[PDB]
């Protein structure tokens, strides 16, 4: 009874591993990637997209400050 429910959790965990692996560019459909590689590579990839998000927010903030600087300069020239 618990033996059939046990294999059902094992099957769902296996599918969960594949779905995670399918999200990692370095592992995408790498058929034989073991469990500990999927975990470690998923962690590394997650940290990379968090670092990327921080970089883009920073770039975006600078561009917006440059935009306001440029608009102020344009307005100053038009009124001088």
């Amino acid at each position: 009874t618990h033996n059939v429910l046990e294999r059902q959790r094992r099957n769902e965990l296996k599918r969960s591993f594949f779905a995670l692996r399918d999200q990692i560019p370095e592992l995408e459909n790498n058929e034989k990637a073991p469990k500990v590689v999927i975990l470690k590579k998923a962690t590394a990839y997650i940290l990379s997209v968090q670092a990327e998000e921080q970089k883009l927010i920073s770039e975006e903030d600078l561009l917006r400050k440059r935009r306001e600087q440029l608009k102020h300069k344009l307005e100053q020239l038009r009124n001088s």
Partner: protein, 73 residues
């Protein structure tokens, strides 16, 4: 002796993965939930980084135009 070390690496790597997923913060999630939440978070972050990169491209185009308006004066 090679099997207990390998499952101890699995356990540590599950903990590290779980700790990197913000929605799992302070949750003793199951292994299946850790995997599913990390998959969903990766998909959410990929879209969010794509949107940010498109906003950046827009700002670069606006700024290049503005600088041309400035230089024309």
């Amino acid at each position: 002796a090679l099997e207990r070390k390998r499952r101890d690496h699995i356990k540590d790597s599950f903990h590290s993965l779980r700790d990197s997923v913000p929605s799992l913060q302070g949750e003793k999630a199951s292994r299946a939930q850790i995997l599913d939440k990390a998959t969903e978070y990766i998909q959410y972050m990929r879209r969010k980084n794509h949107t940010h990169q498109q906003d950046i491209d827009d700002l670069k185009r606006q700024n290049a135009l503005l600088e041309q308006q400035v230089r024309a004066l």
